[PDB]
Amino acid sequence: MESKVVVPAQGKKITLQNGKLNVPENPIIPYIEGDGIGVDVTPAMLKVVDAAVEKAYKGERKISWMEIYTGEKSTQVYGQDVWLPAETLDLIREYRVAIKGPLTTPVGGGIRSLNVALRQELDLYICLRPVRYYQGTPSPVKHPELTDMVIFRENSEDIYAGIEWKADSADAEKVIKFLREEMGVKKIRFPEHCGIGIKPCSEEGTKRLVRAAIEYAIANDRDSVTLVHKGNIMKFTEGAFKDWGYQLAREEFGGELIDGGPWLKVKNPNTGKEIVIKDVIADAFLQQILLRPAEYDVIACMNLNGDYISDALAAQVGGIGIAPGANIGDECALFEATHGTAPKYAGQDKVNPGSIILSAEMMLRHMGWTEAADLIVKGMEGAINAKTVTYDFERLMDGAKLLKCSEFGDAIIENM
Amino acid sequence: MESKVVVPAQGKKITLQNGKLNVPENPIIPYIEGDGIGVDVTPAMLKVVDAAVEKAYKGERKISWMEIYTGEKSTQVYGQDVWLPAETLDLIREYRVAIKGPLTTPVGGGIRSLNVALRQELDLYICLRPVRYYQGTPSPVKHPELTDMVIFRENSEDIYAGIEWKADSADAEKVIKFLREEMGVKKIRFPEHCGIGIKPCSEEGTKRLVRAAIEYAIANDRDSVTLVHKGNIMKFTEGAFKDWGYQLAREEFGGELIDGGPWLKVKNPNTGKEIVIKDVIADAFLQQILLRPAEYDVIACMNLNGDYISDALAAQVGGIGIAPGANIGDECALFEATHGTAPKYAGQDKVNPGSIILSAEMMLRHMGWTEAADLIVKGMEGAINAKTVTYDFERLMDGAKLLKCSEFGDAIIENM
């Protein structure tokens, strides 16, 4: 079967030189519509982004969107069982920057998370989730405005990597036998009818993630980088992540001891500001983001903890449905809606397109088109402040004007 | 070296018959003072409990407290390196019910969590953490009163079990080689300088925990039991826990499908009430407890997720320092302060004794001395409502009377 992807006639491919993106005035940007509500939110995003680009650069620049496939629609286009075509991985890597709506992974066929597959296959080791409050957003907490953090979640290792064997399977037994007999493991409480998962954490995986977090703090003049981990129980994976993170701050960024430690101070080479490098145990951290949110800024953590932390933070600022996200690697980057597919509402032009729109903001910023990105933030801030919002926000407030998904996209443009 | 434990002259040992505690009028109850602030909070707890017992039963009953050791004080009593004496495990099992202040595990000597050691060695497979709001408590959220949950956290398996090998160690290499060569593992991103942890989850471990959760919902007429897990990524450990949990509800409690599922309804044999058995993915759950707290009641989950969930919930209700906890097994139970040792304040009679006092409330309730337990809840509710509290609460409010740790214990008694 032929590829059904159509490369835009006008449009030029983004290139990478010396680890720096070279973006033309007419970049081809691949996009995955997404399953379920992706059908609603993606078009709102395309329109909002085109408007921001048109307004910022007065017609000098323009994105040539190219639809590519993954998920339920991919099976519709390429046939039963084509959930993630090879061409999709090829195209994201070739065109360097892409965006996607929510994806659904089927159940019953032994297929693992399509979102994780994209991240692992493309080696997008940074899951970047910035979380801030937008004035006017209904929130369950008293001071959501105190939250302004950026989460760097390791995206290629941890238990999130999918190495595991089913209870009572021949493989599980084999592994448990090796552990008990050759490794002398005495701590498996019930070795029978027991499932087994493997959690890897490496020095190289940890350091490339923490390096990106510290460079971001420097590049954006943030106040601190907090290593969040559960090292007091998982000494060799979570504890090693923390140790390697502090070690990297010392070896590559000149970090030095604050008082008697354990915190370090790293001098911002551009501003002379001292960035604090600290650490917090993960369970205590889930309490601290609620109780002392103002004391945290950039966060570096492992895969599973990052998933929890980014979700908990989004909820607290009232942003469960407008949280942006990016998966970034050394050769390419994939921006994404961070919510699910909400099939019950699919096609109703009802849901909030804010998450994919703000992920597009991160995308434009990543491309160096910061003026267009600033216009989207401005637009989002004005529409929410105007209380002209979708039902998920409207239902939580008094005096709001209820808008359709498409209408909220226009409200964002109207506020640019 | 002789044992330094002194068995109370007056006082009788609690016995267990047919899985039911037979508590005398003069039970001997072992207690571990705890390190750091345990020196402050334990005496407040002893006094408050004695008062509640004295008031409820008019002198007919009385606890004969017997101090036993674990932690820093144990090394002080039994010598360098005796962090957890064998006699302590023996005594808790023999006397059936005990309580402890916070414990400190040393760093640099390869010793793992003393709290986890107690739980694993005594097979206290249920970590029970009830979380409710006490009117008048300063909270970071707008409606903490909507939170009234009981967490049943599996306490004997999961990654929390401590099976792991250090990066670059001969053992780690051996394990990684076996995984890659004999198991055909292709998903370890960086196999060099890589730490490895093992996550076990068994049918027997899962079902004894979920069985206890459902029996508790029945015994206390709660509305639902929610299985929280990360099964969409960890199919064979977290996903198996969820599957086995629903299976147990069906096989032992007559659970039946609600609509087309996946939820089940279990009929309360005593009240005829229909208890809902449902499940929520763990990351979404950390958002749901903030956004829709009223929809949750009894929670059943694995070791690591339970640690996070119980900490997150305590923070949200303003209870980070007054959260009670119990570790329960089939032969004995150990109640515990759930906060840390806060050495900076140790000996200052300053910290909040509320957590260990409420854990003592759970202890009395476990012993069937519910009248004495009710008096402590009443006392706690009145003291907090009176705004006569310790600094951790006082510093967050206006119009409060600041009390010392010991003074807050009296305030609780004054409000019985």
Side-chain angles (χ1 to χ4, degrees), chain A residues 142-183:
Chain A
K142 291 177 188 168
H143 297 292
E145 78 274 0
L146 292 187
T147 293
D148 183 356
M149 309 184 196
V150 181
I151 311 310
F152 276 73
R153 159 189 178 198
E154 199 292 314
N155 236 5
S156 74
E157 313 183 305
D158 202 355
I159 193 87
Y160 228 91
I163 306 168
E164 46 163 1
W165 304 274
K166 188 171 195 301
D168 283 321
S169 76
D171 279 331
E173 335 255 44
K174 182 187 178 170
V175 172
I176 290 152
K177 181 182 173 73
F178 168 78
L179 290 178
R180 294 178 70 207
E181 282 168 14
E182 332 299 336
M183 289 318 297

mmCIF file of all heavy atoms in Angstrom, chain A residues 142-183:
data_model
loop_
_atom_site.group_PDB
_atom_site.id
_atom_site.type_symbol
_atom_site.label_atom_id
_atom_site.label_comp_id
_atom_site.label_asym_id
_atom_site.label_seq_id
_atom_site.Cartn_x
_atom_site.Cartn_y
_atom_site.Cartn_z
ATOM 1 N N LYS A 142 -6.915 27.388 46.950
ATOM 2 C CA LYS A 142 -7.029 28.790 47.324
ATOM 3 C C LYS A 142 -6.045 29.749 46.627
ATOM 4 O O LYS A 142 -6.400 30.887 46.365
ATOM 5 C CB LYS A 142 -6.831 28.929 48.830
ATOM 6 C CG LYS A 142 -7.938 28.356 49.698
ATOM 7 C CD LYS A 142 -7.501 28.533 51.160
ATOM 8 C CE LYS A 142 -8.401 27.842 52.164
ATOM 9 N NZ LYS A 142 -7.652 27.867 53.470
ATOM 10 N N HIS A 143 -4.816 29.312 46.365
ATOM 11 C CA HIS A 143 -3.849 30.190 45.705
ATOM 12 C C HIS A 143 -3.126 29.555 44.527
ATOM 13 O O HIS A 143 -1.898 29.424 44.551
ATOM 14 C CB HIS A 143 -2.853 30.628 46.730
ATOM 15 C CG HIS A 143 -3.475 31.428 47.811
ATOM 16 N ND1 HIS A 143 -3.998 32.684 47.579
ATOM 17 C CD2 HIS A 143 -3.751 31.127 49.101
ATOM 18 C CE1 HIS A 143 -4.573 33.121 48.689
ATOM 19 N NE2 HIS A 143 -4.437 32.197 49.625
ATOM 20 N N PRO A 144 -3.865 29.230 43.452
ATOM 21 C CA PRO A 144 -3.257 28.595 42.282
ATOM 22 C C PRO A 144 -2.237 29.484 41.593
ATOM 23 O O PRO A 144 -1.361 28.984 40.903
ATOM 24 C CB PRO A 144 -4.442 28.288 41.382
ATOM 25 C CG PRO A 144 -5.433 29.373 41.700
ATOM 26 C CD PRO A 144 -5.292 29.537 43.216
ATOM 27 N N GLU A 145 -2.344 30.797 41.813
ATOM 28 C CA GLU A 145 -1.442 31.746 41.185
ATOM 29 C C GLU A 145 -0.011 31.579 41.685
ATOM 30 O O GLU A 145 0.925 32.027 41.047
ATOM 31 C CB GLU A 145 -1.945 33.172 41.410
ATOM 32 C CG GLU A 145 -1.653 33.723 42.810
ATOM 33 C CD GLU A 145 -2.714 33.347 43.824
ATOM 34 O OE1 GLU A 145 -3.692 32.647 43.442
ATOM 35 O OE2 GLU A 145 -2.554 33.757 44.997
ATOM 36 N N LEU A 146 0.175 30.905 42.806
ATOM 37 C CA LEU A 146 1.510 30.685 43.341
ATOM 38 C C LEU A 146 2.266 29.574 42.605
ATOM 39 O O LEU A 146 3.442 29.331 42.854
ATOM 40 C CB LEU A 146 1.398 30.327 44.820
ATOM 41 C CG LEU A 146 0.926 31.445 45.759
ATOM 42 C CD1 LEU A 146 1.017 31.014 47.201
ATOM 43 C CD2 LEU A 146 1.833 32.639 45.571
ATOM 44 N N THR A 147 1.574 28.877 41.722
ATOM 45 C CA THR A 147 2.173 27.780 40.958
ATOM 46 C C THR A 147 2.686 28.213 39.581
ATOM 47 O O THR A 147 1.904 28.647 38.713
ATOM 48 C CB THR A 147 1.134 26.633 40.752
ATOM 49 O OG1 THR A 147 0.837 26.048 42.030
ATOM 50 C CG2 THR A 147 1.650 25.555 39.756
ATOM 51 N N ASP A 148 3.995 28.053 39.380
ATOM 52 C CA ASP A 148 4.640 28.405 38.109
ATOM 53 C C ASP A 148 5.858 27.505 38.034
ATOM 54 O O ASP A 148 6.956 27.876 38.443
ATOM 55 C CB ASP A 148 5.065 29.863 38.156
ATOM 56 C CG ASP A 148 5.690 30.340 36.855
ATOM 57 O OD1 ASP A 148 5.884 29.531 35.913
ATOM 58 O OD2 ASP A 148 5.990 31.556 36.795
ATOM 59 N N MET A 149 5.654 26.308 37.504
ATOM 60 C CA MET A 149 6.714 25.321 37.448
ATOM 61 C C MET A 149 6.883 24.755 36.048
ATOM 62 O O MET A 149 6.011 24.909 35.174
ATOM 63 C CB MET A 149 6.396 24.175 38.434
ATOM 64 C CG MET A 149 6.062 24.661 39.836
ATOM 65 S SD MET A 149 5.822 23.268 40.997
ATOM 66 C CE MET A 149 4.983 24.075 42.401
ATOM 67 N N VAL A 150 8.032 24.118 35.840
ATOM 68 C CA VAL A 150 8.330 23.486 34.566
ATOM 69 C C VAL A 150 8.877 22.106 34.891
ATOM 70 O O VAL A 150 9.933 21.958 35.509
ATOM 71 C CB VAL A 150 9.376 24.283 33.720
ATOM 72 C CG1 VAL A 150 9.617 23.562 32.387
ATOM 73 C CG2 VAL A 150 8.851 25.686 33.437
ATOM 74 N N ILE A 151 8.145 21.089 34.460
ATOM 75 C CA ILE A 151 8.539 19.732 34.737
ATOM 76 C C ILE A 151 9.319 19.091 33.595
ATOM 77 O O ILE A 151 8.834 19.045 32.460
ATOM 78 C CB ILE A 151 7.279 18.797 34.994
ATOM 79 C CG1 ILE A 151 6.300 19.432 36.004
ATOM 80 C CG2 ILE A 151 7.750 17.392 35.418
ATOM 81 C CD1 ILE A 151 6.918 19.931 37.284
ATOM 82 N N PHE A 152 10.516 18.597 33.925
ATOM 83 C CA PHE A 152 11.349 17.845 32.992
ATOM 84 C C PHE A 152 11.235 16.411 33.482
ATOM 85 O O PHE A 152 11.865 16.033 34.473
ATOM 86 C CB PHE A 152 12.828 18.301 33.052
ATOM 87 C CG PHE A 152 13.106 19.502 32.201
ATOM 88 C CD1 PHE A 152 12.647 20.770 32.589
ATOM 89 C CD2 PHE A 152 13.735 19.359 30.979
ATOM 90 C CE1 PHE A 152 12.810 21.877 31.742
ATOM 91 C CE2 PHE A 152 13.901 20.457 30.135
ATOM 92 C CZ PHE A 152 13.438 21.712 30.510
ATOM 93 N N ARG A 153 10.415 15.628 32.800
ATOM 94 C CA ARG A 153 10.194 14.217 33.141
ATOM 95 C C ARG A 153 10.995 13.322 32.204
ATOM 96 O O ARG A 153 10.885 13.429 30.972
ATOM 97 C CB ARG A 153 8.693 13.923 33.029
ATOM 98 C CG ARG A 153 8.298 12.476 32.848
ATOM 99 C CD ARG A 153 6.792 12.427 32.535
ATOM 100 N NE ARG A 153 6.337 11.054 32.295
ATOM 101 C CZ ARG A 153 5.208 10.707 31.679
ATOM 102 N NH1 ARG A 153 4.362 11.625 31.207
ATOM 103 N NH2 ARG A 153 4.931 9.412 31.547
ATOM 104 N N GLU A 154 11.827 12.455 32.774
ATOM 105 C CA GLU A 154 12.643 11.537 31.976
ATOM 106 C C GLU A 154 11.650 10.667 31.209
ATOM 107 O O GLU A 154 10.736 10.114 31.798
ATOM 108 C CB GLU A 154 13.533 10.707 32.908
ATOM 109 C CG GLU A 154 14.748 10.051 32.211
ATOM 110 C CD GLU A 154 14.346 8.953 31.227
ATOM 111 O OE1 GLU A 154 13.481 8.100 31.584
ATOM 112 O OE2 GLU A 154 14.892 8.946 30.103
ATOM 113 N N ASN A 155 11.860 10.514 29.906
ATOM 114 C CA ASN A 155 10.915 9.841 29.043
ATOM 115 C C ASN A 155 11.379 8.547 28.420
ATOM 116 O O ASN A 155 10.665 8.021 27.565
ATOM 117 C CB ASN A 155 10.602 10.784 27.866
ATOM 118 C CG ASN A 155 9.144 11.096 27.680
ATOM 119 O OD1 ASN A 155 8.282 10.708 28.466
ATOM 120 N ND2 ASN A 155 8.860 11.839 26.614
ATOM 121 N N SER A 156 12.541 8.015 28.780
ATOM 122 C CA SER A 156 13.001 6.819 28.085
ATOM 123 C C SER A 156 13.298 5.594 28.929
ATOM 124 O O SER A 156 13.559 4.522 28.373
ATOM 125 C CB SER A 156 14.261 7.163 27.220
ATOM 126 O OG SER A 156 15.410 7.330 28.049
ATOM 127 N N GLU A 157 13.286 5.738 30.247
ATOM 128 C CA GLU A 157 13.590 4.596 31.125
ATOM 129 C C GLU A 157 12.485 4.430 32.172
ATOM 130 O O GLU A 157 11.320 4.746 31.896
ATOM 131 C CB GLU A 157 14.919 4.808 31.859
ATOM 132 C CG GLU A 157 16.008 5.264 31.014
ATOM 133 C CD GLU A 157 17.316 5.378 31.778
ATOM 134 O OE1 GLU A 157 17.390 6.079 32.825
ATOM 135 O OE2 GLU A 157 18.273 4.758 31.296
ATOM 136 N N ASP A 158 12.869 3.936 33.356
ATOM 137 C CA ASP A 158 11.952 3.693 34.472
ATOM 138 C C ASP A 158 11.034 2.475 34.168
ATOM 139 O O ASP A 158 11.116 1.863 33.080
ATOM 140 C CB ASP A 158 11.109 4.953 34.711
ATOM 141 C CG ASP A 158 10.533 5.017 36.112
ATOM 142 O OD1 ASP A 158 10.700 4.037 36.864
ATOM 143 O OD2 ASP A 158 9.907 6.041 36.466
ATOM 144 N N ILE A 159 10.173 2.140 35.133
ATOM 145 C CA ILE A 159 9.206 1.042 35.012
ATOM 146 C C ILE A 159 8.250 1.321 33.841
ATOM 147 O O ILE A 159 7.604 0.411 33.288
ATOM 148 C CB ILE A 159 8.387 0.921 36.326
ATOM 149 C CG1 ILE A 159 7.608 -0.397 36.334
ATOM 150 C CG2 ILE A 159 7.473 2.166 36.506
ATOM 151 C CD1 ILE A 159 8.419 -1.567 36.888
ATOM 152 N N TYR A 160 8.189 2.596 33.455
ATOM 153 C CA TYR A 160 7.342 3.082 32.372
ATOM 154 C C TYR A 160 7.833 2.535 31.056
ATOM 155 O O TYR A 160 7.181 2.715 30.044
ATOM 156 C CB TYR A 160 7.357 4.630 32.336
ATOM 157 C CG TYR A 160 6.014 5.295 32.247
ATOM 158 C CD1 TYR A 160 5.300 5.666 33.396
ATOM 159 C CD2 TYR A 160 5.446 5.586 31.006
ATOM 160 C CE1 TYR A 160 4.023 6.325 33.309
ATOM 161 C CE2 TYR A 160 4.201 6.224 30.916
ATOM 162 C CZ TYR A 160 3.485 6.592 32.077
ATOM 163 O OH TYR A 160 2.203 7.165 31.932
ATOM 164 N N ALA A 161 8.961 1.843 31.061
ATOM 165 C CA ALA A 161 9.516 1.287 29.840
ATOM 166 C C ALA A 161 8.875 -0.010 29.337
ATOM 167 O O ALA A 161 9.276 -0.522 28.271
ATOM 168 C CB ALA A 161 10.978 1.042 30.023
ATOM 169 N N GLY A 162 7.965 -0.597 30.121
ATOM 170 C CA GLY A 162 7.283 -1.809 29.675
ATOM 171 C C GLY A 162 7.976 -3.161 29.641
ATOM 172 O O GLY A 162 7.634 -4.000 28.795
ATOM 173 N N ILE A 163 8.947 -3.378 30.531
ATOM 174 C CA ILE A 163 9.642 -4.659 30.643
ATOM 175 C C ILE A 163 8.940 -5.404 31.787
ATOM 176 O O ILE A 163 9.127 -5.072 32.957
ATOM 177 C CB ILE A 163 11.120 -4.475 31.026
ATOM 178 C CG1 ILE A 163 11.791 -3.520 30.029
ATOM 179 C CG2 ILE A 163 11.814 -5.826 31.105
ATOM 180 C CD1 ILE A 163 13.176 -3.029 30.475
ATOM 181 N N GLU A 164 8.133 -6.402 31.464
ATOM 182 C CA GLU A 164 7.411 -7.103 32.516
ATOM 183 C C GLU A 164 6.874 -8.399 31.958
ATOM 184 O O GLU A 164 6.759 -8.535 30.740
ATOM 185 C CB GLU A 164 6.245 -6.227 33.011
ATOM 186 C CG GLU A 164 5.442 -5.600 31.880
ATOM 187 C CD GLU A 164 4.059 -5.085 32.319
ATOM 188 O OE1 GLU A 164 3.733 -5.195 33.519
ATOM 189 O OE2 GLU A 164 3.296 -4.564 31.470
ATOM 190 N N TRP A 165 6.553 -9.334 32.862
ATOM 191 C CA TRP A 165 6.013 -10.656 32.516
ATOM 192 C C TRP A 165 4.771 -10.983 33.368
ATOM 193 O O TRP A 165 4.732 -10.723 34.577
ATOM 194 C CB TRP A 165 7.074 -11.732 32.731
ATOM 195 C CG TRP A 165 8.312 -11.467 31.972
ATOM 196 C CD1 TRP A 165 8.563 -11.818 30.678
ATOM 197 C CD2 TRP A 165 9.439 -10.697 32.415
ATOM 198 N NE1 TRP A 165 9.777 -11.312 30.278
ATOM 199 C CE2 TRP A 165 10.340 -10.614 31.319
ATOM 200 C CE3 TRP A 165 9.779 -10.062 33.625
ATOM 201 C CZ2 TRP A 165 11.574 -9.909 31.400
ATOM 202 C CZ3 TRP A 165 11.006 -9.360 33.709
ATOM 203 C CH2 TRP A 165 11.882 -9.291 32.601
ATOM 204 N N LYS A 166 3.781 -11.568 32.705
ATOM 205 C CA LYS A 166 2.500 -11.942 33.288
ATOM 206 C C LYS A 166 2.552 -13.072 34.338
ATOM 207 O O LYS A 166 3.296 -14.040 34.185
ATOM 208 C CB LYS A 166 1.568 -12.329 32.141
ATOM 209 C CG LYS A 166 0.137 -12.561 32.543
ATOM 210 C CD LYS A 166 -0.717 -12.719 31.326
ATOM 211 C CE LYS A 166 -2.177 -12.582 31.702
ATOM 212 N NZ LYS A 166 -2.522 -13.632 32.715
ATOM 213 N N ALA A 167 1.759 -12.933 35.403
ATOM 214 C CA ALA A 167 1.700 -13.934 36.462
ATOM 215 C C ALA A 167 1.432 -15.315 35.847
ATOM 216 O O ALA A 167 0.615 -15.451 34.942
ATOM 217 C CB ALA A 167 0.592 -13.593 37.448
ATOM 218 N N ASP A 168 2.131 -16.317 36.352
ATOM 219 C CA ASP A 168 1.979 -17.676 35.882
ATOM 220 C C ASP A 168 2.449 -17.976 34.470
ATOM 221 O O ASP A 168 2.273 -19.089 33.992
ATOM 222 C CB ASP A 168 0.532 -18.102 36.037
ATOM 223 C CG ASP A 168 0.199 -18.450 37.463
ATOM 224 O OD1 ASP A 168 1.045 -19.057 38.144
ATOM 225 O OD2 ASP A 168 -0.903 -18.103 37.904
ATOM 226 N N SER A 169 3.031 -17.004 33.789
ATOM 227 C CA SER A 169 3.546 -17.249 32.445
ATOM 228 C C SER A 169 4.875 -17.980 32.614
ATOM 229 O O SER A 169 5.513 -17.890 33.661
ATOM 230 C CB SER A 169 3.761 -15.923 31.684
ATOM 231 O OG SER A 169 4.927 -15.254 32.127
ATOM 232 N N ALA A 170 5.289 -18.715 31.586
ATOM 233 C CA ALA A 170 6.544 -19.445 31.646
ATOM 234 C C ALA A 170 7.678 -18.452 31.873
ATOM 235 O O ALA A 170 8.580 -18.718 32.664
ATOM 236 C CB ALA A 170 6.755 -20.202 30.366
ATOM 237 N N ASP A 171 7.624 -17.303 31.194
ATOM 238 C CA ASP A 171 8.658 -16.269 31.342
ATOM 239 C C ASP A 171 8.808 -15.705 32.747
ATOM 240 O O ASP A 171 9.938 -15.534 33.231
ATOM 241 C CB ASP A 171 8.375 -15.138 30.398
ATOM 242 C CG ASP A 171 8.853 -15.443 29.005
ATOM 243 O OD1 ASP A 171 9.841 -16.217 28.872
ATOM 244 O OD2 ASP A 171 8.233 -14.914 28.054
ATOM 245 N N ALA A 172 7.672 -15.396 33.383
ATOM 246 C CA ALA A 172 7.657 -14.889 34.768
ATOM 247 C C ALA A 172 8.313 -15.930 35.684
ATOM 248 O O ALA A 172 9.190 -15.593 36.495
ATOM 249 C CB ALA A 172 6.217 -14.627 35.225
ATOM 250 N N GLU A 173 7.900 -17.197 35.564
ATOM 251 C CA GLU A 173 8.499 -18.246 36.399
ATOM 252 C C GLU A 173 10.016 -18.319 36.231
ATOM 253 O O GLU A 173 10.759 -18.442 37.210
ATOM 254 C CB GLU A 173 7.918 -19.605 36.044
ATOM 255 C CG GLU A 173 6.561 -19.542 35.448
ATOM 256 C CD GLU A 173 5.518 -19.977 36.434
ATOM 257 O OE1 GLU A 173 5.620 -19.546 37.614
ATOM 258 O OE2 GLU A 173 4.606 -20.749 36.037
ATOM 259 N N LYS A 174 10.454 -18.252 34.973
ATOM 260 C CA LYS A 174 11.864 -18.306 34.629
ATOM 261 C C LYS A 174 12.600 -17.162 35.295
ATOM 262 O O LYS A 174 13.648 -17.342 35.913
ATOM 263 C CB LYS A 174 12.026 -18.206 33.114
ATOM 264 C CG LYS A 174 13.482 -18.304 32.626
ATOM 265 C CD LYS A 174 13.554 -18.018 31.129
ATOM 266 C CE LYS A 174 14.973 -18.045 30.571
ATOM 267 N NZ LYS A 174 14.895 -17.999 29.067
ATOM 268 N N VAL A 175 12.043 -15.967 35.169
ATOM 269 C CA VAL A 175 12.674 -14.821 35.795
ATOM 270 C C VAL A 175 12.670 -14.965 37.323
ATOM 271 O O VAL A 175 13.688 -14.705 37.977
ATOM 272 C CB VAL A 175 11.950 -13.496 35.373
ATOM 273 C CG1 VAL A 175 12.474 -12.335 36.162
ATOM 274 C CG2 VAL A 175 12.142 -13.255 33.900
ATOM 275 N N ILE A 176 11.543 -15.379 37.910
ATOM 276 C CA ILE A 176 11.526 -15.482 39.358
ATOM 277 C C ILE A 176 12.508 -16.537 39.857
ATOM 278 O O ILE A 176 13.141 -16.371 40.910
ATOM 279 C CB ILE A 176 10.114 -15.773 39.892
ATOM 280 C CG1 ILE A 176 9.225 -14.533 39.703
ATOM 281 C CG2 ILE A 176 10.182 -16.082 41.390
ATOM 282 C CD1 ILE A 176 7.736 -14.844 39.538
ATOM 283 N N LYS A 177 12.646 -17.619 39.098
ATOM 284 C CA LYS A 177 13.584 -18.684 39.469
ATOM 285 C C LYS A 177 15.023 -18.163 39.462
ATOM 286 O O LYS A 177 15.817 -18.414 40.393
ATOM 287 C CB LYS A 177 13.459 -19.842 38.486
ATOM 288 C CG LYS A 177 14.385 -20.992 38.803
ATOM 289 C CD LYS A 177 14.238 -22.062 37.754
ATOM 290 C CE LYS A 177 15.286 -23.148 37.952
ATOM 291 N NZ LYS A 177 14.960 -23.987 39.148
ATOM 292 N N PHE A 178 15.358 -17.442 38.394
ATOM 293 C CA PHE A 178 16.686 -16.870 38.286
ATOM 294 C C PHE A 178 16.918 -15.937 39.479
ATOM 295 O O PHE A 178 17.955 -16.005 40.137
ATOM 296 C CB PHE A 178 16.830 -16.091 36.968
ATOM 297 C CG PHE A 178 18.073 -15.241 36.905
ATOM 298 C CD1 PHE A 178 19.307 -15.814 36.631
ATOM 299 C CD2 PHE A 178 18.013 -13.867 37.151
ATOM 300 C CE1 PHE A 178 20.469 -15.037 36.606
ATOM 301 C CE2 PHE A 178 19.170 -13.077 37.125
ATOM 302 C CZ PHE A 178 20.399 -13.664 36.853
ATOM 303 N N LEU A 179 15.945 -15.067 39.773
ATOM 304 C CA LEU A 179 16.106 -14.129 40.885
ATOM 305 C C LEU A 179 16.323 -14.833 42.228
ATOM 306 O O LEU A 179 17.218 -14.489 43.006
ATOM 307 C CB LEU A 179 14.877 -13.204 40.977
ATOM 308 C CG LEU A 179 14.638 -12.147 39.888
ATOM 309 C CD1 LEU A 179 13.347 -11.395 40.185
ATOM 310 C CD2 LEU A 179 15.834 -11.183 39.841
ATOM 311 N N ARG A 180 15.491 -15.833 42.493
ATOM 312 C CA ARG A 180 15.589 -16.540 43.754
ATOM 313 C C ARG A 180 16.798 -17.469 43.812
ATOM 314 O O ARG A 180 17.525 -17.476 44.807
ATOM 315 C CB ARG A 180 14.299 -17.325 44.007
ATOM 316 C CG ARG A 180 13.100 -16.431 44.211
ATOM 317 C CD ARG A 180 11.848 -17.236 44.406
ATOM 318 N NE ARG A 180 11.851 -17.932 45.687
ATOM 319 C CZ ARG A 180 11.195 -19.064 45.908
ATOM 320 N NH1 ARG A 180 10.491 -19.630 44.942
ATOM 321 N NH2 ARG A 180 11.210 -19.602 47.104
ATOM 322 N N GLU A 181 17.021 -18.224 42.743
ATOM 323 C CA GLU A 181 18.130 -19.161 42.720
ATOM 324 C C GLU A 181 19.510 -18.623 42.405
ATOM 325 O O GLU A 181 20.469 -18.973 43.081
ATOM 326 C CB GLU A 181 17.820 -20.280 41.762
ATOM 327 C CG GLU A 181 16.879 -21.257 42.361
ATOM 328 C CD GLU A 181 16.351 -22.206 41.340
ATOM 329 O OE1 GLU A 181 16.932 -22.265 40.216
ATOM 330 O OE2 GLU A 181 15.353 -22.888 41.668
ATOM 331 N N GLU A 182 19.624 -17.789 41.381
ATOM 332 C CA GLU A 182 20.929 -17.251 41.015
ATOM 333 C C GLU A 182 21.242 -15.912 41.672
ATOM 334 O O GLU A 182 22.403 -15.597 41.911
ATOM 335 C CB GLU A 182 21.032 -17.126 39.499
ATOM 336 C CG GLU A 182 20.177 -18.135 38.767
ATOM 337 C CD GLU A 182 20.578 -19.579 39.078
ATOM 338 O OE1 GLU A 182 21.765 -19.774 39.461
ATOM 339 O OE2 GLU A 182 19.714 -20.511 38.943
ATOM 340 N N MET A 183 20.216 -15.125 41.981
ATOM 341 C CA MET A 183 20.455 -13.824 42.588
ATOM 342 C C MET A 183 20.257 -13.848 44.100
ATOM 343 O O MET A 183 20.551 -12.865 44.791
ATOM 344 C CB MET A 183 19.553 -12.745 41.951
ATOM 345 C CG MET A 183 19.912 -12.339 40.500
ATOM 346 S SD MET A 183 21.702 -12.144 40.131
ATOM 347 C CE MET A 183 22.172 -10.788 41.208
#
